[PDB]
């Protein structure tokens, strides 16, 4: 038949092409050329073409013949699989030592060894951190299993894949060196995030749920456990960072491997189409498509033999990138998956033309084609018209195999849905909604009564004797003893805080049902859960997040405990908002859900439940008495800080002569009676002497970070401030903290506060944020105390005395009133400006044209040149760095916002001309001509010398200040005026406006 | 850091029988995976680990020896040599046919262990070098080889058992298991097997020359093996073993072992000599073998064997802290009952090793208890651990593979097919006007006759990888057996004929009586060693020289007996063959598809060399013409140039001519000229080592050389050739025709050569010109380079004769000391004597101390045989030395008569 015919073909070419240097016994592939290296990637990778060979062969067999020929398939699979977990199960330590803190030093080798599968670098030799292979790698690994061959033998295999689980669910946090093994877009790498890993290890986590590495024989302990919660993060850093690959790489063609063939992980249909289109029309060249704008890999410059850049990349990478053919042999299976067929023989007429025909007559897919050297010049004239020759290494097994398979797709012979039989191609199928259920108890009998009295039914703990209630930090205690191992040092799971996906399922444990309560109200680790207004506002956004995703089977289980706290002073009733809040979850309609009640009998029935096996069994003394006989709370806190920083960090103060009563001990104690007095005076001052640390503060930074936005920690002025730039671990994080607020203790903890504010504000209202690139706390710190300060009247010790006796909701409230903006009038706005730096959306590209016609633009002594503008971009940051940092010399908010509104009216005044000024251009000049034209007009008019009057320390006039914008008298004319005299003063006496 | 192959393979086969055991539950909850994976995952790392070490498989290929033999131990963390080759020996056998045995049970029970063709190549390779067992040496299972532990190797029957078990299981079978075409099959050598079985068969009573009985030869013996069918005998062993070594805390190793004893110290690795005696009666004590003769007993059905070992295990048994069954290594005796123990033999109660309280454990013991426990409670069927049938009843032995044949077990009445072609027209219708009829080659034209290097050539083409390096199968001569059947070569039948028929160089080869006594034989052999489906086939050729006028008439006599169907008990098929070619088993091989004198020594040495030339050309002689070839080319060269081409050219001629010509004379001459050797001297070799006696090269009155272990040919062919350069001139195929007589008639006559120790072919021939000076009288005596191969046979038969009288008295003496003739019993009676003698014997000036040779040695150990035949060896006069040994068994008779 014509089917065996195409099948030994297929067979012979990859048999010629990729199977002659398979090197059994280890069965390694070399990494092609006479590198004599193996890398992961390109090994997992060159195993696709025979893995859909043989499933092709496996079900249309029937005959010996094809059965052995199956059968060698699967084995040499097998073996390469086998081969590659070798090299990694040999380097325990290394993982385990990665399992704690973020290093390079600590990670896995990225080249592995032939023979003997050894090691051929060091650590300070190679990039060695690619998060992509392993999750790719780990991707196939479960396609594979669940395809039906057995790769897993020993279970001691089954714990170093949980270890390695853990190894690398830390992707949406941790900065790679990238899929190039290149850092960020310059030499000198540096660790940077990227979309590609975390939406490769995205799918990776999601594939192993529940698929077990034993088949259809497996036992009570086969299967991998996996979260929730950090499928959800990297869903939502890729959303947020899906146009950009990175934010110093404006666009990379490796977004197409993600949202494609490997590991669908997108959602809204309308970003996929928006990427393919500007893909399409920015990186399309002639024979090849590019990875990414301004690359020098493999250019007749560079000088080869060298390496670390130098930052001239003028004009000598631009234009001359050579071309990438992977990106186009990517197009045509991503169009014949799904359902389009005109453009997949659009791209194979394409690259029909621009194959290689080698020995034996067979396809051959070369690397890249190259510029030649002498035809140079008119390129940069006449982009992607000059022809370019084959240069490099072309025995690329990667493309040849994958090309290979989707010609054996498109042939009709395979079909998609045996590729992956986890069904990943319906992932832009929407889900509809989903019901949340919730439950009520009453801790007391009081509380029930109370409960009652309103019309409300509950139960308290006692009365469902089978079921139990723990909080969530036993939870993850229990959840820290998964995958331990004494034989192999292998300690499990670390502790981490348990988000709110996993308490809402139910869970066994030894014939036992438990349920645990969410983590927001947990009084012991800080105070921001007192108060009811945010315990509100913390079940709403929790059940918002509940309701919008909840991609596991079953309905949601809520459980919300009242406590004690949570009545009014006299304890006789609970508070207005919790009963409001309970009469709105009543009638199924509660923030932006729809939300059930009932009891636990009937919820049980109908509720996804967790079956766990792996716990189955196998002189001072007179201070110590004045503390005594002392009373009032700040008097206990002072002497308690003095004992506890001179000489009782853990002494005995002997002030019990029965229980030996340590410092610790007492301050934790004072908890309880500050606590009833609501006296938010002292209890950030014992909390900062506990120092008491807020959870997912690094997840928050990130979160942050991802917005391209750069974090500042410490006041002003340099060295005391500092940026943090890249993400960083909770214990350097802290650490940094804490050298940036030095001694004032408190300054921590608001600005850890106000860190959490800002975070819960981003994902709510991102569009407050706009016309501001670098957050400042002790800018923030210093505003909102001058406000209310003004606010109140009253001196600096009184207004930051009345800052920290606010309660949190006053500064949620105070911080969104600032946020949003809502003599003496116009100074204030002024100052507000000149202190939150708001410069308009279009600052920078309209300065950067203006220093296009002009040699620079000086703000006293300090020169801004215009060697610049061809060393940059717009959009790169690095430029509006500079610029931030020549405007910011002055300290006077109002001389920054003047010096704005002068530099732009330049800008609108440079338009109307047509001409090269050829000269710097001072701006303090410009406007101490307004200043001085103002002054005269004033003058002319007949006031009086009280209004003209002169600040101490500026030369403008407060008249000036307090003037308006715009308007007739506005100083937006002077400027005008002002700005044109100096460039007539500088004009070959001619101006030729014309517009 | 150290690991064993043999423990580790243990516990892999007792785990995949304890998930065999488990398999017969549908809810076991996957508790078979994790034992298969086990077992998989152990075989697959001790595979890679064989086949980390390539080099050294490619050498001792082609050079056996300690240096190239394969690592046994090495590193288990990362597979990796830890300690050099000079402080273990490394070399060892046995482990590796066990674990062939045992991948080959597994992958017949239905488990998957290869996945590419390269490991089939590896394993090709592993059986081509195991092939070559029986001669090399090995250090035995114990490590220490010889009871005297000095350095030195001995050869051992379990694992040449265990090599014959191995090979014969690995013939025609699927590696792949359930699915495989052409390239899963394994394809074995007949003559090593029969090789391998007769080592076997004359060493089985002794498991080695310095040791008498040994506790090692149970697991040949056992389960693991299965290899002695033979019943009686294996009941005198079974016998005799539990005899001589039944303990009352199990069985010992074997007698007179000091090993890790009370007096033994960790500072000398060899033992001095005269220690073995101290070391007597503090053998330690091992009770895993309880275990394996309750397993023996278990497949037997004989649960009184069962029942009593269970009872004696009971007690010594350990019990861990949750009371778990242990099983100690070895027991020791304390050292207040050093020598309280020795008056009276197990009064005295031993005490247990550090391995049998806490900490420390011997997982082989623990496993073979496992598996016998496992066993006795019946929860398995012998079947199910043995789907290869290693152990077959009496009454299923009628229908076997490779081990008996369909007559049955005592039954021999095999008939053989035999195809007669002819090669010439004129001698088939030669023959056909008397009678005879027969086929010329040019009307089989579907059918192809070709010479035996046809078959060595394709066979070197098998087996050659080019990622590792691989030379294939050794260019060696095919046997009789081989070649007796019939291949298919790129689909054509190919059909060959013993390497007898074809020309040889040769001399015998012209005679019509050697001829027909080797075609018999050759008949006898395929006759008594042949098992397999379907009669064999045998082609006979005869050429029109063979006639040669007169010396028609013996083969038409021996035609005329072929045709008549009896050839001397033996009975023959005679047909064409194309019916006997028609509905027969062809075998294919497809594996290349896939892929007096007038001149004088002295008087014209001196002669110029223009002068010799000149007396070349113009001479008729032979004798004349070799012994002026011979001059020319020790005086110039080989590489001069004559009338007749080169030198070599001319020697070459001129001798195929004396062959032609038959002068025995001028033959031997040119075949030392030629520098040739038989293909055969090495079994002949070898099977006189295996036998026990001894032989010796040289020449009568000069320097000799003993040889005492088996040697490479190239270093024999050295030192033969080197003595011949030395003494004389055509000895050497004198010698050659003498041993290939010898060994011919050792082999179908042992019990002629009974009483002979050391074998001296020039001591023999001295003899044979002797008798034949004798029988001349009168007449010159004829000289012995003029006889024919018929009346040297003749003479060697009548010299070998046990001799009545009659003759001289003289000559009889005289013949039987040149042979070194000893009587039946000497060496016993020189024992029994130096026990009684407490001073000592002195002959021809040679001392043999008491007190050594009591400390040494024991009643019938070969050594002292050796020693005392040294020291009777200096006699000179033969007759005198038969005289001594008379006098000593008078001496012997009259004192053990009388202990007065």
């Known amino acids: 038949s014509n089917s065996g015919v195409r099948l030994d073909g297929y067979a012979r070419l990859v048999q010629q092409t990729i199977l002659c240097h398979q090197n059994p016994v280890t069965g390694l592939l070399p990494a092609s050329y006479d590198q004599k290296d193996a890398w992961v990637r390109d090994n997992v990778y060159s195993i696709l073409a025979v893995w859909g060979l043989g499933l092709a062969y496996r079900k249309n067999a029937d005959r010996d013949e094809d059965k052995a020929k199956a059968y060698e398939l699967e084995q040499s699979v097998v073996k390469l699989m086998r081969g590659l977990l070798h090299c990694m199960i040999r380097q325990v330590d290394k993982v385990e030592s990665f ?141 947020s960072l899906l146009p950009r690959a990175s934010t110093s790489k404006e666009v990379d063609a490796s977004l197409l491997s993600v949202v494609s063939f490997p590991a669908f992980a997108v959602e809204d249909s309308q970003l996929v189409e928006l990427t393919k289109q500007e893909i399409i029309t920015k990186l399309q060249g002639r024979y090849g498509c590019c990875r990414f704008l301004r690359d020098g890999y493999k250019t007749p410059k560079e000088d080869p033999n060298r390496l670390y850049y130098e930052p001239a990349e003028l004009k000598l990478f631009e234009n001359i990138e050579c071309e990438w053919p992977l990106f186009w042999t990517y197009f045509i299976l991503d169009g014949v998956f799904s359902g389009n067929a005109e453009q997949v023989q659009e791209y194979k007429e394409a690259l029909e033309a621009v194959l290689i025909k080698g020995k034996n007559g067979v396809p051959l897919l070369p690397e890249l084609y190259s510029v030649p050297p002498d035809r140079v010049d008119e390129e940069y004239q006449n982009p992607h018209t000059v022809d370019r020759v084959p240069m490099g290494k072309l025995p690329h097994m990667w493309g040849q195999s994958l090309y290979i398979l989707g010609s054996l797709m498109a042939e009709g012979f395979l079909a998609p849905g045996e590729i992956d039989p986890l069904n990943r191609r319906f992932s832009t199928v929407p889900k509809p909604d989903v019901v949340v259920q919730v439950s009520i108890l009453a801790e007391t009998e009081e509380i029930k009564t109370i409960l009652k009295d309103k019309g409300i039914y509950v139960e308290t703990i006692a009365e469902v004797y089978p079921i139990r209630v723990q909080p969530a930090r036993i939870l993850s205690h229990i959840y820290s003893s998964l995958g331990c191992n004494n034989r192999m040092k292998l300690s499990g799971r670390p502790y981490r805080h348990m988000g709110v996906l996993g308490t809402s399922k139910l869970y066994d444990i030894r014939k036992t049902i438990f349920t645990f309560t969410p983590q927001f109200i947990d009084q012991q680790q800080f105070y921001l859960a007192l108060d009811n207004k945010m315990i509100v506002e913390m079940l709403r956004t929790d059940l918002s997040y509940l309701c919008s995703r909840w991609r596991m089977t079953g309905q949601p289980t809520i459980t919300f405990p009242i406590s004690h706290s949570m009545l009014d002073e006299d304890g006789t009733s609970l508070n207005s908002s919790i009963l409001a809040a309970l009469r709105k979850m009543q009638d199924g309609y509660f923030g932006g859900a729809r939300v059930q009640t009932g009891k636990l009998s009937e919820f049980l029935t109908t509720s996804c439940c967790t079956h766990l096996s792996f716990m189955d069994p196998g002189d001072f003394k007179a201070l110590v008495l004045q503390l005594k006989e002392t009373s009032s709370l700040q008097e206990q806190a002072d002497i308690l800080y003095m004992l506890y920083t001179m000489k009782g960090p853990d002494w005995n103060t002997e002030l019990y002569n029965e229980r030996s009563a340590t410092v610790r001990e007492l301050l934790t104690e004072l908890y309880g009676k500050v606590g009833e007095i609501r006296h938010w005076g002292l209890i950030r001052y014992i909390s900062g002497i506990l120092r008491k640390k807020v959870e997912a503060l690094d997840e928050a930074c990130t979160d942050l970070l991802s917005h391209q936005k750069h974090l500042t920690v410490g006041l002003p002025p340099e060295p005391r401030e500092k940026t943090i730039s890249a993400p960083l671990p909770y214990e350097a994080l802290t650490q940094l903290i804490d050298e940036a607020s030095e001694g004032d203790m408190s300054i921590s903890i608001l600005t850890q506060e106000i860190m959490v504010y800002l975070a819960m504000y981003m994902r709510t209202q991102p569009g407050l944020f706009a016309e501001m690139f670098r957050l400042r706390i002790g800018l923030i710190i210093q505003v909102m105390a001058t406000e209310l300060a003004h606010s109140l009247r009253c001196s600096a010790e009184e207004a930051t005395e009345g800052l920290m006796n606010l309660s949190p909701s006053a500064m949620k409230n105070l911080l969104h009133h600032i946020l949003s903006g809502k003599q003496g009038q116009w100074q204030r706005r002024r100052r507000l400006d000149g202190a939150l730096n708001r410069v308009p959306v279009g600052f920078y590209q309209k300065v950067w044209k203006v220093l296009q016609k002009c040699h620079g633009l000086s703000v006293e002594g300090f020169v801004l040149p215009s060697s610049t503008t061809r060393e940059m971009t717009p959009g790169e940051i690095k430029f509006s760095v500079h610029v931030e940092s020549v405007l910011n010399r002055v300290p006077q908010p109002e001389y920054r916002q003047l010096l704005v509104e002068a530099i732009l009216v330049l800008t609108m005044l440079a338009d109307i001309e047509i001409h090269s000024i050829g000269s710097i251009i001072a701006v303090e000049k410009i406007v101490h001509i307004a200043n001085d034209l103002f002054l005269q007009e004033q003058k002319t008019l007949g006031a009086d010398d009280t209004m003209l009057a002169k600040d101490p320390a500026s030369g403008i006039c407060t008249l000036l200040y307090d003037s308006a914008p715009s308007g007739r008298f506005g100083t937006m004319t002077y400027l005008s005026k002002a700005a044109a005299t100096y460039v007539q003063e500088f004009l070959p006496h001619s101006i030729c406006a014309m517009q | 850091q150290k690991a064993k192959i043999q423990d580790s393979l243990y516990c892999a086969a007792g785990a995949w029988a304890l998930a065999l055991a488990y398999r017969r539950i549908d809810d076991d909850k996957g508790r078979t995976h994790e034992l298969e994976h086990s077992a998989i995952k152990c075989m697959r790392g001790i ?158 009573p002794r498991e080695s020359r310095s040791h008498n009985t040994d506790a090692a030869l149970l697991p040949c013996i056992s389960y693991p093996a299965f290899a002695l069918d033979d019943e009686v005998l294996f009941s005198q062993t079974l016998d005799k073993v539990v005899r001589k070594l039944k303990g009352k805390y199990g069985f010992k190793r074997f007698l007179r072992d000091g090993y890790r004893t009370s007096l033994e110290d960790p500072n000398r690795c060899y033992y001095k000599p005269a220690e073995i005696k101290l070391f007597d009666g503090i053998e330690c004590e091992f009770p895993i073998f309880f275990l394996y003769m309750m397993i023996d007993g278990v497949f037997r059905g004989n649960p009184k064997q069962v029942q009593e070992y269970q009872d004696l295990l009971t007690p010594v048994l350990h019990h861990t802290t949750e009371g778990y069954p242990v099983v100690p290594k070895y027991y020791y005796v304390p050292a207040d009952f050093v020598e309280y123990e020795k008056n009276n033999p197990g009064s005295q109660k031993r005490f247990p090793s550090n391995c049998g309280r806490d900490g420390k454990l011997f997982l082989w013991g623990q496993a073979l208890y496992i598996i016998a426990k496992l066993l006795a409670d019946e929860l398995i069927s012998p079947k199910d651990i043995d789907p290869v049938q290693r152990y077959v009843p009496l009454k299923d032995q009628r229908n076997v593979s490779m081990r008996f044949s369909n007559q049955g077990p005592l039954e021999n009445d095999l008939v053989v097919h035999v195809a007669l072609i002819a090669e010439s027209q004129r001698l088939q219708v030669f023959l056909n006007t008397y009678g005879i009829q027969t086929q010329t080659p040019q009307q089989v034209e579907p059918i192809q006759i070709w010479p035996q290097q046809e078959l060595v050539k394709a066979y070197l083409q098998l087996g050659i990888n080019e990622k590792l390096g691989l030379s294939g199968r050794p260019d060696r001569p095919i046997g009789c057996l081989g070649t007796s059947k019939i291949y298919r070569i790129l689909g054509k039948t190919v059909v060959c004929y013993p390497i007898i028929f074809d020309l040889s160089d040769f001399y015998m080869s012209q005679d019509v009586f050697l001829l027909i006594d080797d075609i018999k034989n050759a008949l006898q052999f395929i006759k008594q060693y042949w098992k397999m489906h379907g009669r064999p086939l045998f082609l006979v050729l005869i050429r029109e020289d063979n006639i040669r006028g007169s010396r028609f008439n013996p083969i038409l006599d021996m035609l005329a007996a072929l045709k008549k169907g009896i050839i001397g008990g033996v009975k023959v098929h005679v047909d064409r063959l194309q019916t006997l070619i028609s509905g027969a088993v062809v075998e294919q091989l ?127 062919q050295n030192i033969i050739y080197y003595k011949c350069n030395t003494h004389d001139e055509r000895e050497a195929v004198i010698q050659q025709e003498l041993v290939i007589h010898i060994g011919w008639i050792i082999s179908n006559n042992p019990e002629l050569f009974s009483g002979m120790l050391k074998i001296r072919i020039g001591w023999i021939i001295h003899a044979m010109e002797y008798e034949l000076q004798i029988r001349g009288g009168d007449k010159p005596a004829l000289d012995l380079y003029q006889l024919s191969p018929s009346e040297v046979k003749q003479l060697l038969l009548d010299i070998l004769q046990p001799q009545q009288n009659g003759r001289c008295w003289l000559n009889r003496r005289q013949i039987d000391g040149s042979l070194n003739r000893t009587p039946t019993g000497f060496y016993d009676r020189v024992w029994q004597i130096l026990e009684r003698t407490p001073n000592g014997i002195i002959v021809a000036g040679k001392h043999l101390p008491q007190q050594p040779t009591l400390s040494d040695m024991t009643m019938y150990e070969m050594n002292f045989s050796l020693l005392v035949e040294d020291t009777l060896g200096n006699i000179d006069q033969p007759q005198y030395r038969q005289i001594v040994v008379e006098l000593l068994m008078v001496v012997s008779i009259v004192l053990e008569r009388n202990p007065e």
């Not at chain 2, 001297?681 to 020449?699: D, E, M, N, S, Y």
């Open chain 2, 590 to 716: 497809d594996f290349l598809r896939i892929s007096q004198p007038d001149v004088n020594i002295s008087e014209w040495k001196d002669k110029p060399t223009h002068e010799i030339l000149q007396k070349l050309n113009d001479c008729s002689c032979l004798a004349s013409q070799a012994i002026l070839l011979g001059i020319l080319l020790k005086r110039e060269g080989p590489n001069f140039i004559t009338k007749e081409g080169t030198v070599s050219d001319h020697i070459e001629r001129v001798y195929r001519r004396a062959g032609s010509q038959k002068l025995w004379l001028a033959v031997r001459y040119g075949a030392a000229f030629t520098q040739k050797f038989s293909s055969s001297i090495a079994p002949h070799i070898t099977t006189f080592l295996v036998h026990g006696k001894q032989v010796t090269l040289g020449a009568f009155g000069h320097e000799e050389e003993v040889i005492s272990n088996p040697l490479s040919p190239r270093v024999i």
């Open chain 1, 99 to 239: 399992k704690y803190s973020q290093s390079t030093k600590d990670s896995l080798h990225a080249k592995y060894n032939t023979k003997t599968c050894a090691t051929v670098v060091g650590d300070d030799q190679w990039g060695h951190l690619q998060l992509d292979a392993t999750s790719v790698y780990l991707l196939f690994l479960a396609q594979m299993t669940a395809s039906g061959l057995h790769i897993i033998h020993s279970l001691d295999e089954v714990n170093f894949i949980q270890n390695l689980v853990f190894y690398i669910e830390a992707a949406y946090k941790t900065a790679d060196f990238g899929i190039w093994e290149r850092g960020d877009k310059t030499n000198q790498g540096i660790s940077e995030l990227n979309a590609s890993s975390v939406g490769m290890a995205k799918a990776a986590l999601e594939a192993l749920d529940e698929l077990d590495l034993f088949g259809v024989k497996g036992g009570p302990q086969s299967v991998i456990h996996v979260l929730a919660d950090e499928v959800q993060h990297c869903q939502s850093i890729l959303n």
């Open chain 2, 47 to 204: 595979l890679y680990c064989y086949m980390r070490q390539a080099d050294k498989v490619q050498q001792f290929k082609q050079d056996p020896r300690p240096t190239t033999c394969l690592h046994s131990v090495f590193n288990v963390h990362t597979g990796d040599e830890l300690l050099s080759y000079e402080e273990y020996g490394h070399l060892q056998i046995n482990a590796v046919s066990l674990y062939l045995l045992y991948l080959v049970e597994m992958i017949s029970s239905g488990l998957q262990i290869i996945y590419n063709t390269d490991e089939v190549s590896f394993i090709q390779n592993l059986v081509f070098c195991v092939e070559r067992v029986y001669r090399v040496p090995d250090f035995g299972v114990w490590e220490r080889g010889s009871k005297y532990n000095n350095g030195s190797t001995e050869l051992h029957s379990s694992s040449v058992g265990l090599a014959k078990a191995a090979l014969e299981a690995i013939n025609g079978f699927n590696l792949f298991g359930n699915q495989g075409c052409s390239w899963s099959v394994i394809f074995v050598d007949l003559d090593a097997h029969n090789r391998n079985r007769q080592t076997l068969c004359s060493l089985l």
